Design a protein around this ligand. Sequence first.
Ligand SMILES: [Cl-]
Ligand SMILES: [Cl-]
Ligand SMILES: [Cl-]
Ligand SMILES: [Cl-]
Ligand SMILES: [Cl-]
Ligand SMILES: [Cl-]
Ligand SMILES: [Cl-]
Ligand SMILES: [Cl-]
Ligand SMILES: [Cl-]
Ligand SMILES: [Cl-]
Ligand SMILES: [Cl-]
Ligand SMILES: [Cl-]
Ligand SMILES: [Cl-]
Ligand SMILES: [N+]
Ligand SMILES: [N+]
Ligand SMILES: [N+]
Ligand SMILES: [N+]
Ligand SMILES: [N+]
Ligand SMILES: [N+]
Ligand SMILES: [N+]
Ligand SMILES: [N+]
Ligand SMILES: [N+]
Ligand SMILES: [N+]
Ligand SMILES: [N+]
Ligand SMILES: [N+]
Ligand SMILES: [N+]
Ligand SMILES: [N+]
Ligand SMILES: [N+]
Ligand SMILES: [N+]
Ligand SMILES: [N+]
Ligand SMILES: [N+]
Lengths: 210, 213, 212, 228
Amino acid sequence: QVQLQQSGPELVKPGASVKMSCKASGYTFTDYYMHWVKQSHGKSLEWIGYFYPNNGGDGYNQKFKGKATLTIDKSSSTAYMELRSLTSEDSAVYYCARGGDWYFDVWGAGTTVTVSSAKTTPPSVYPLAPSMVTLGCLVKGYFPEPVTVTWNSGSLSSGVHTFPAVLESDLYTLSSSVTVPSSPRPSETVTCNVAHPASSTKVDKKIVPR
Amino acid sequence: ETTVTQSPASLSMAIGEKVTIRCITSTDIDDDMNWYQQKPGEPPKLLISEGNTLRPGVPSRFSSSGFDTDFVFTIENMLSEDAADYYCLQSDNSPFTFGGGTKLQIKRADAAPTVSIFPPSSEQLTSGGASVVCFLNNFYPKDINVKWKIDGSERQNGVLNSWTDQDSKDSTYSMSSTLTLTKDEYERHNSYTCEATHKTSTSPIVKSFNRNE
Amino acid sequence: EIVLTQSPGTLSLSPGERATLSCRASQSVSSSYLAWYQQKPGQAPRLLIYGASSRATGIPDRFSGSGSGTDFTLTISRLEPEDFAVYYCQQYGSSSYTFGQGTKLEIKRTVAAPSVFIFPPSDEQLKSGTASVVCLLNNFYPREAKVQWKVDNALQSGNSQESVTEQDSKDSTYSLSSTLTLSKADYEKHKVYACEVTHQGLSSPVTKSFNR
Amino acid sequence: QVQLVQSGAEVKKPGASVKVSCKASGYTFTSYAMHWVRQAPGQRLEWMGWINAGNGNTKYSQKFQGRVTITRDTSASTAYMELSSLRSEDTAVYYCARVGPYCGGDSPQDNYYMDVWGKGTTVTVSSASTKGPSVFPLAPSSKSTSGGTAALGCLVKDYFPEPVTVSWNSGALTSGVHTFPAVLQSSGLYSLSSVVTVPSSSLGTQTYICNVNHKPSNTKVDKKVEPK
Ligand SMILES: [Cl-]
Ligand SMILES: [Cl-]
Ligand SMILES: [Cl-]
Ligand SMILES: [Cl-]
Ligand SMILES: [Cl-]
Ligand SMILES: [Cl-]
Ligand SMILES: [Cl-]
Ligand SMILES: [Cl-]
Ligand SMILES: [Cl-]
Ligand SMILES: [Cl-]
Ligand SMILES: [Cl-]
Ligand SMILES: [Cl-]
Ligand SMILES: [Cl-]
Ligand SMILES: [N+]
Ligand SMILES: [N+]
Ligand SMILES: [N+]
Ligand SMILES: [N+]
Ligand SMILES: [N+]
Ligand SMILES: [N+]
Ligand SMILES: [N+]
Ligand SMILES: [N+]
Ligand SMILES: [N+]
Ligand SMILES: [N+]
Ligand SMILES: [N+]
Ligand SMILES: [N+]
Ligand SMILES: [N+]
Ligand SMILES: [N+]
Ligand SMILES: [N+]
Ligand SMILES: [N+]
Ligand SMILES: [N+]
Ligand SMILES: [N+]
């Protein structure tokens, strides 16, 4: 099972630099191209460049000349991209994708980069309790994106609605609902598991009634 | 640079019907056109690659044709799972350029939202803030408004909304409206009402609660 | 579609002269990814220029390339005898890798009209199904010539192949062999068979004919 | 020294498949791509596809997308090219060509020019099998004379596979001889004519015989061309 494993989210001060990674497994890393793609929020995709370990060469899109620098570590089957002197427009999701050769077949999960002067802030989770019951969690005041939310460590995959976060004064606010039959709850536990990897935070809020 | 022009920007089609997207290019790219599907929160998924090549594992509902400057992508007997974004990619010359993207939405029978209102928690009140969250889940079409009322009078300030993408199963939408107030601004009123007006009912779907429970 | 139109079709020059070959692309070629190739009669191609202006390993200095975007130029300062061959331009900036139709480089000489000869079919082949009429254009220059077959003054079509010899290694002329192939019945049913020729060396189209 | 060795010439009936091979020698086989080009007789070069010898990833041409296939055996340092659904217009010479060395750049096609070519493999598509030629005389007549010069010849018709070697008077006649290239006819059989100009004065005294060899069919033929 070919799979690419990218680094976690990053918060970069304006004018600073970041260097993300993309560790390959399930195939010979040195025998295939590695392409890097950028996707700004709610927008199309854009090819940054490639790196070919076989010939030890690379090549960039003119748009990213002087912004991107591609390297590799053959010993660890890991590709790296460095972005230098970042501005707010540089903030987006950055994908690595294996080349086939010049089209991209297997994509990474994507690394979220945020360029801002605001400092990292963890979320505050607040329970939302009231034939079929609906509960929820309010993930308020966190920064930067992203946050992942699950219910009962994933056991409640269906009937869930996690909503896109809203940005106010340099703080994100997200909400997630979950609908279950009237038997499991209050009778049984229903907790929302929130994760903010940017601040390395893991919160577990169990929804109970009053 | 090879300019790829993908159209339409969005299109709505029923379940069993046929979808057809096209990408025109500024230059000749032989048949080096690739077609991706991207669902929310995921990376693009390669469906078709150079030469109209359907990747293994992809349903046969997807095909494509074209060469030189005119390419087309079609889905026969569409399904609810196909609701996503679709991008085309040229791998003929560098820089490799993507298309504008096409958002694909299911067209189904209207559905009324399941409105649920929630008072703020003691956790947030102890922190000095109050948020009234209302959930409007599983409705169609996406057009819908939310009125908030405190003690019987409408309020629009301090309201934040957000929608989800079309559900992959029932092809519906959901929204969360949050009314954020001060602790003492919240403690100075009793009845909070979440009002939802939808195409599925002339009378709005109202969900309220008094701060005396 | 991308089209690399080389001009001229054939370049007629003498050894020790400056040869200029042109290549025109229907779409701009990025980064000057334009290559030139030489192909001698009956041999595989050989790389001359890559990148539109860089000689490959082994090419003499008389070969030079220039241009960018749409128009490119191969230049040979002093033609050597071995340089008389075909030359192809290719674009490798896109994944079509299109070639030009080619430019032939021949020896220049004075116009020589063709001496036409027609050969009626031998009765020896009548017992098969076919009757092959042969028309010979002998020792002529330039190679451009139009040959038409007329049976009862009716121009035939799609039934007469031809063939040309390489430029003569002594008199630098060409020779062509056109062969009209009819059926036994088709041949015995008609009377006159004419071979009309058109060439730069003739003020009027010559016509050779016979009749059963 | 870099060398590309292609397989030998092939003959396939229409609708069959041909597989040409191409072995590399003096370089790291896996660090270069391998183009495949074809050329119909008298027409231009036409690119078919390349393969990455390192990982097998290919690139084809829209004109052959459905029926071409380029593979590689990396142990043998060899590339292959299969072409299916052969038509009469697939008859051509098929070349393999290695790309150039990598010397930087931004586009990955900076070195994708055909750098080193193979001598080529001839592929002929025809429903015919080995058959010897039919030699008919091109007798000299009033319609084949010009002043003191008279033209005669032989018509070597319907043979397969080529080549044939035509000579006159067992090689004793060479000046004035024009043997034209062979023509592949509608029937899938070759056909060429060999002519020679001679003095019409010395026409009733000299004997002119054309000698055609066709070792594919193990055949020799001697035809006396006589004025009629
Ligand atoms: Cl993956
Ligand atoms: Cl595996
Ligand atoms: Cl209940
Ligand atoms: Cl509590
Ligand atoms: Cl093409
Ligand atoms: Cl008030
Ligand atoms: Cl070399
Ligand atoms: Cl001609
Ligand atoms: Cl007729
Ligand atoms: Cl073989
Ligand atoms: Cl470029
Ligand atoms: Cl006569
Ligand atoms: Cl005699
Ligand atoms: N760079
Ligand atoms: N670089
Ligand atoms: N900027
Ligand atoms: N973002
Ligand atoms: N943990
Ligand atoms: N807990
Ligand atoms: N369209
Ligand atoms: N799908
Ligand atoms: N390019
Ligand atoms: N262009
Ligand atoms: N005869
Ligand atoms: N063969
Ligand atoms: N074969
Ligand atoms: N090498
Ligand atoms: N193979
Ligand atoms: N490059
Ligand atoms: N006669
Ligand atoms: N005659």
